[PDB]
Amino acid sequence: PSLSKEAALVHEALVARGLETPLRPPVHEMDNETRKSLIAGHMTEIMQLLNLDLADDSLMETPHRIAKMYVDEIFSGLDYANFPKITLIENKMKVDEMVTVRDITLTSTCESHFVTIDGKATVAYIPKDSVIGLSKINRIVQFFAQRPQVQERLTQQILIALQTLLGTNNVAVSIDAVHYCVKARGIRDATSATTTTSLGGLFKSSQNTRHEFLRAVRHHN
Amino acid sequence: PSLSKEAALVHEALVARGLETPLRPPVHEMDNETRKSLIAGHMTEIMQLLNLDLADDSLMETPHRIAKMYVDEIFSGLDYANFPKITLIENKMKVDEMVTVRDITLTSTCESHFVTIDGKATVAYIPKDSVIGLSKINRIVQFFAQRPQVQERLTQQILIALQTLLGTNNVAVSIDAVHYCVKARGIRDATSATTTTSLGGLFKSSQNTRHEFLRAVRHHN
Amino acid sequence: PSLSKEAALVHEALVARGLETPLRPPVHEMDNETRKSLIAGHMTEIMQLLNLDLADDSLMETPHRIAKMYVDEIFSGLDYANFPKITLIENKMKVDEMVTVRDITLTSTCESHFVTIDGKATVAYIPKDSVIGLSKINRIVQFFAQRPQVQERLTQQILIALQTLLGTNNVAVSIDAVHYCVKARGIRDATSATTTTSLGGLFKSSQNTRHEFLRAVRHHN
Amino acid sequence: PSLSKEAALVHEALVARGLETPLRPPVHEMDNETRKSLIAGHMTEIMQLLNLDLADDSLMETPHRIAKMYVDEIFSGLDYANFPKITLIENKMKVDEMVTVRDITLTSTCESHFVTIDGKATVAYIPKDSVIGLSKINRIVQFFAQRPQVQERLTQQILIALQTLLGTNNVAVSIDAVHYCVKARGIRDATSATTTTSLGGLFKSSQNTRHEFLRAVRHHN
Amino acid sequence: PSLSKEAALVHEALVARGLETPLRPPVHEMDNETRKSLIAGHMTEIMQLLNLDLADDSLMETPHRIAKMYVDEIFSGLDYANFPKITLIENKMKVDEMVTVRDITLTSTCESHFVTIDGKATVAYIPKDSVIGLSKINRIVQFFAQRPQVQERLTQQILIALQTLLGTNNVAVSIDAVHYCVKARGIRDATSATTTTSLGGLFKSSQNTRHEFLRAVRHHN
Amino acid sequence: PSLSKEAALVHEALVARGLETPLRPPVHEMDNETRKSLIAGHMTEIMQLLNLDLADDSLMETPHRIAKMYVDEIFSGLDYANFPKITLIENKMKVDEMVTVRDITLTSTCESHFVTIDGKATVAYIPKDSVIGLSKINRIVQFFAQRPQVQERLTQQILIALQTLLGTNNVAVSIDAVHYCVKARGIRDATSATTTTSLGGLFKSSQNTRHEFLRAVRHHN
Amino acid sequence: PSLSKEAALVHEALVARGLETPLRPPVHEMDNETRKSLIAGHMTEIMQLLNLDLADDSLMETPHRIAKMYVDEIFSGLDYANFPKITLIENKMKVDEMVTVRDITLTSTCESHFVTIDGKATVAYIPKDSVIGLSKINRIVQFFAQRPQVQERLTQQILIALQTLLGTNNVAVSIDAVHYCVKARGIRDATSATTTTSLGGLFKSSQNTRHEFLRAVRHHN
Amino acid sequence: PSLSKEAALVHEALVARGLETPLRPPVHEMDNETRKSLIAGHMTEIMQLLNLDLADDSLMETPHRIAKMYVDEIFSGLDYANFPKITLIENKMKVDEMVTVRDITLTSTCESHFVTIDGKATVAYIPKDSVIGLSKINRIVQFFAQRPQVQERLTQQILIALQTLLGTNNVAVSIDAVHYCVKARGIRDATSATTTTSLGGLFKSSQNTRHEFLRAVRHHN
Ligand SMILES: Nc1nc2c(ncn2[C@@H]2O[C@H](COP(=O)(O)OP(=O)(O)OP(=O)(O)O)[C@@H](O)[C@H]2O)c(=O)[nH]1
Ligand SMILES: Nc1nc2c(ncn2[C@@H]2O[C@H](COP(=O)(O)OP(=O)(O)OP(=O)(O)O)[C@@H](O)[C@H]2O)c(=O)[nH]1
Ligand SMILES: Nc1nc2c(ncn2[C@@H]2O[C@H](COP(=O)(O)OP(=O)(O)OP(=O)(O)O)[C@@H](O)[C@H]2O)c(=O)[nH]1
Ligand SMILES: Nc1nc2c(ncn2[C@@H]2O[C@H](COP(=O)(O)OP(=O)(O)OP(=O)(O)O)[C@@H](O)[C@H]2O)c(=O)[nH]1
Ligand SMILES: Nc1nc2c(ncn2[C@@H]2O[C@H](COP(=O)(O)OP(=O)(O)OP(=O)(O)O)[C@@H](O)[C@H]2O)c(=O)[nH]1
Ligand SMILES: Nc1nc2c(ncn2[C@@H]2O[C@H](COP(=O)(O)OP(=O)(O)OP(=O)(O)O)[C@@H](O)[C@H]2O)c(=O)[nH]1
Ligand SMILES: Nc1nc2c(ncn2[C@@H]2O[C@H](COP(=O)(O)OP(=O)(O)OP(=O)(O)O)[C@@H](O)[C@H]2O)c(=O)[nH]1
């Protein structure tokens, strides 16, 4: 009937470190539909200001599609009600070596221009008492990515979230991404990409562990 | 003091073919600055509906950046004042074989979701009386690309525009593109790409010519 | 309050050609939850027959996960209530060249062993009166794929469905896939893959069009 | 007339470490044929709940094929009667440098969804008194792989089994795998892969050794 | 009404280190058009000295094109009026790990022959109190690149400029490039490329930090 | 004591077809040295106009280098005194199948901006009475490339030149190139390339021969 | 006690077609050892003319090594006593489709400069009454390759020899090679390669057969 | 009127280290033309000993071509009058990090068999007081390469020459090459290549510097 234990813990953990995405507390419990109608209205206006003919079949539904996309899709991560269900199992295997999930599909939106960020994450962790379900790592990366973002902040949030859930600081996150506000606009750099890393526990502390992780990052197909 | 001879011709040709992007005639000669301020206003409202903290340094200038992007950047192609300066030379070389410009960078926006379209175009033409300046082919592709688009329409527009400018129907246009409204959202298909082609003159009529062009399309790096 | 016009038409079209997947009409309007509890019960038994310790945290929820996966996920295409919302726009562009969507992600299950089929589809069509929304092609391929399948049948169903929706026989479908019941079991062939094609209208009729499509099939990344 | 010396030793070692796959002791010495018939029965029921027409030629033998697959194929590793015949030779060569077998085909099933796990293992060991037959390394990996698994556990099992058989703790195991329960369903991440490692003896203790092994891991074709 | 605080600061810092490109102070505030007409005249003479027929439509506008290129394009970085607008945000994320922007498109001209330098830059920095906008790193690299250059000096300039702007010495710059004065002329080495690096702060001091950066350098596509 | 028979014939043939690069007849038999001194002076002026400090060691010799480059280097192809020594052998082998030389290095300069053109040529011909020395094909391509060029013209010149020298119209020339005036400036398209072809004799006439050649063109490494 | 039946027939066929490599009949039956001593002496003189210190251990044996190489190695194909032993089997399989041996290692020496030619041959034939041993095709290519060659001639020679041996004109030979007299000297083109083909029977006559062969040529690894 | 200051110093340095290629001092100041005529004669004899028909147009000029090649081409590095003109600039940039020129085209001849050596050199140095012109590094590599060589010696020679010229011991040279006397003859190993390195100053002394260099060696295209 509310946020899960994990959603709450992770959110609290992020607020405490001052890492939460700039979001304002629920000012009014207004149904999403009203938000979507409102947003669509604004988009109708913007399109009119761009002199686009909204009468055309190809543009007619765009304001509603954009509203739905903002509220229901690309920024779904802002609502913790969409936080992934987390499942863990006892580390009976007694695994004390890192588990790495590489090339995680990452789709995000840069907050400076509200434009596509296309990337891939690599997450590693040394299991302590529990082993997390592999897909949950993918879902967590994707939860934070479905928000207007700053890559540097995104990498931190995923790290903190995982540390919190796994009960260990021994987590490492790395994200490699192409920002379309850099690529298809402005400086229009067709080839560059940005890499950001957030190292936890031994990944930070131990150069041995650190470089094992870093060496593993970016392995072509 | 107005649109170039070329911009006027191309625009006319497109209107004649019913190919123009759904744009409404200049209802009011209002300076771009007011449109940008009004659009920025709407974006501000939208971000507030999304509960984003516009007081944050990273989000504070977003509404302005987006308004500037829509009006001055990604949709610059909607304004024929931005049409490329066309330069040609006499076909003294008597070239009667196609000239092909492959892998032309193409950055566009889909009009259904106002999301990134990342593509590459391949354009070929058989010189009649004139040889067009190479970069002009790239600029024309980019001119029509910088608009809310439907890839199928975009391909048509580039073909007509080039036929008009080159004074020959023997032009062929092929665009291969990734639609982020397909890739990073909805069906979320991380691998697909869409190919559209517009064949004219001999490229449509002559199977020999047609397949020479088609075979040439898509040559890895 | 029922199936959409398109879902109905497509289903009727498939039944008429005898191409429907072997599915029995709704014998009882029993809620999915009962089906899932029933299926989970069966899976509990099977696991017990395999002497697996369902008391272990890692196996405890498997019967429920499998039930959910069968009913709600991997065979969701069996229920036309899950048929994609189809959107089309007038072919005002007057496009009379084929539109190809290549490398469509295809995830299916072979009906002989209920094992993973991992593939990619390539769909082409010559627009007649309408142009279909690009993602709808991806969603249609995926609707039929989320069913116990025989690749040869799958390719036919997608073809017929598209022809029906697009109002044209000029459609071509090609699927390239790896069957894990061939790869990870039995003959254990680690390298082979199967290609199946269903050519419609001109794709069948015209060798010119046919080979243009076939030549386009399979383009590495 | 029973399990080999090796199968017995390895099984004991695994039980000792609490590493055995959740399997219950032989409650009844019932012939595989009855289990297969009962499992096939349950699959029949499931397919009927999914409304599949079992009268169809393609679906008619499915319940039998699945029962045979579970009992005799994909889970064959659960029965130590299937343990590989181990052959070793005297380390007369006095090899005191690691021997590495890379890219070992690995086909497994995740126990959470009973779906395909497609992977590759890399195994290294420093010969003490004996040199193991190369193919035995592959067969052992495949022995534990043919079971409902948790990749983290699987890696542990292979390490212990090999240490036991080789009489040395100096063994290292690394598995890279694609989980179809992640890729073709749920989060549906088409690009990620999971890497797990189990380091023993010098591979754990000696950083020089450890990194020699880690550097060697993942060498494209 | 003059240079930005940033442009001034960067220019001062470069002059202080004796790193500025050999440029003479504004001897006369003469309008660029005069320079372009003067340069165009010199180019006209040169072409005449080469016996090129400036009457030809293809050559006629060359003197004016080269003039425009030197003054307005390829050497635009010589004028700090063209320095990029820098944006930074508070490092609230508390990022204390390097941020790397790789494969930055770099287009320069060698000062020895005024011929094309085609290259790519990799820049990394450890955020201190502020996080710079990603595109700014790209624009800065390009600002200094659009000048007659010596690759060794160019790397130094970008390093110092970034250190100045970021307020940290923890910055690293690496550039890999092809010099057409080497490739398409003289020794005509079609295969060589040159790599230069400029390490600051921890990138120079800490071998751990240094090699992390160096390892990251050059990652194919 | 003058131009070779071949140099004369080729030059004549090109003038006849109106294919010669826009060059004016020797107005004065002035030694290259004074042309170099004058060009150097104009360059010194240009650099001064750009405010470059010619006192610097790195810039001091630039004017001389650029003068030496224009006169003695990059445009050496304008002087038929540099035409390659042609050697042929009797086609005693009776070869009546095309001989193709692919991936011929081609370094040229666009005449619109006097910038680098980096490309590769593919030449094929059907030997009639004589077989040409293989390197001569490379030298001829390079002869015409070392000139201010228009790619479309360059291809034409190599075709006529070779036909003349081989005494057969059965020659085909294809050039693929990157124009730095398009890549590193203006539209700044980092990915495009231009392909031009000049087909003679059977390569023009016979579609069989034509497509054998065209298929052959562009074979990666 | 002399040349094999095949060596004789092949040599005869080549002489008839005027395809033999310029070799003079055995003027004197002088033992190879004397030729080597004479050749060695000439090389000793040459090296002295080059002022090389033959006293040095690294140069002392060179004259002998070069003599041995010319006589016994690189030009062994000049002596038909080195012709490969040919083995054929009855075409009981009734194969009437081409058999293609691709990527045959080919090492030759150009006769213009006596410098390395590195290439690969592709041979196809339609079996008539016999099927030749696969390795014999490779040995034949190498027989003719081990001679001072002209690639165009070499291709002809292999074709004729094979037709003779196989008793069919339906043979096709293609050779792709890098000539070091072009690459490491003179024009010094580091990227070009030459392709020659010799098509017989149906490969020449039938465009269907001809293009099946040509399409097959050059398949990367 | 004699050898340059650099040619002298370099030659001296090599003699001091006993690294010069086995060359005898100018016994007689005889014009190259006579050497070529003498060498040509010896080659004529050799070819006659091989029974080659020098009357043939393809072989007639070979003796002259080989003479010209030995004297004027492939062994030009033996004469210091061909030493490259060296240009350096003041290290005003204060670069104290290595500058690396990778993939330098290297064409040599092995002295054991006077056969092609195809390789690539990688040179790095830490600038002390001067920065050398980039192309000079390539010209130096090629100066020493154009001699009858021993790869191990060649690598040493380039290292010493560069240290001499740059006035620093901090130079590193690495060469990767294919010897045709190994590949196309004798053992006929078609896949092997040899790698030699010469490390000076810090490249030898500092493992940090040494491994930064080694890691940089061999970067595919
Ligand atoms: N550090 C960081 N910067 C980002 C990110 N997304 C966008 N940016 C940058 O934030 C900045 C926005 O700068 P402004 O100068 O305010 O807007 P702009 O003028 O449109 O920027 P330009 O792209 O350089 O044209 C740009 O430099 C963007 O590239 C991100 O995730 N992290
Ligand atoms: N033909 C065509 N369709 C496009 C293009 N860009 C976007 N579309 C499609 O236009 C359609 C929008 O359909 P709607 O159903 O109206 O919106 P939606 O529900 O968000 O669509 P889904 O992406 O399928 O979730 C989608 O199928 C888009 O993929 C384009 O360039 N051409
Ligand atoms: N044509 C076709 N065959 C399929 C498909 N999926 C699975 N199969 C095959 O259908 C057959 C099942 O054959 P059976 O012989 O009944 O079962 P099986 O003995 O387990 O088959 P083996 O895999 O050969 O061990 C196999 O040959 C499967 O490879 C599909 O989509 N199309
Ligand atoms: N650690 C680990 N987890 C696995 C493995 N195979 C599957 N899993 C995960 O175990 C978990 C099952 O979680 P549940 O939440 O119980 O099932 P689910 O809701 O279908 O999970 P989703 O895939 O996230 O939709 C998933 O996160 C799987 O990806 C494995 O080998 N190791
Ligand atoms: N260190 C360095 N050298 C450069 C750069 N750009 C060009 N050069 C070199 O500066 C030198 C110019 O030398 P000069 O001998 O004065 O001119 P040049 O005779 O045309 O030189 P060659 O190219 O060797 O023919 C060459 O060695 C160029 O390769 C650069 O960025 N850095
Ligand atoms: N057609 C053909 N020509 C070859 C072959 N091997 C070498 N050649 C060429 O035969 C010619 C020898 O020409 P010459 O002009 O007599 O000697 P050269 O001056 O040293 O030739 P350049 O390499 O152009 O410097 C060159 O053009 C070689 O590239 C071959 O197999 N076939
Ligand atoms: N056809 C052809 N055009 C060329 C070639 N080299 C350069 N060009 C083009 O010739 C034209 C010069 O056009 P102008 O408009 O006169 O000069 P510009 O404004 O600097 O051109 P932009 O490059 O578009 O900025 C450009 O479009 C160049 O890309 C060539 O070989 N062939």
Ligand SMILES: Nc1nc2c(ncn2[C@@H]2O[C@H](COP(=O)(O)OP(=O)(O)OP(=O)(O)O)[C@@H](O)[C@H]2O)c(=O)[nH]1
């Ligand atoms: N170290 C070194 N050896 C070389 C080089 N070039 C050639 N060689 C070798 O020097 C040796 C010549 O050996 P010999 O035994 O005198 O002549 P050979 O019998 O023809 O040698 P084989 O190639 O083994 O048939 C060979 O082993 C060559 O491979 C080089 O650059 N460095």
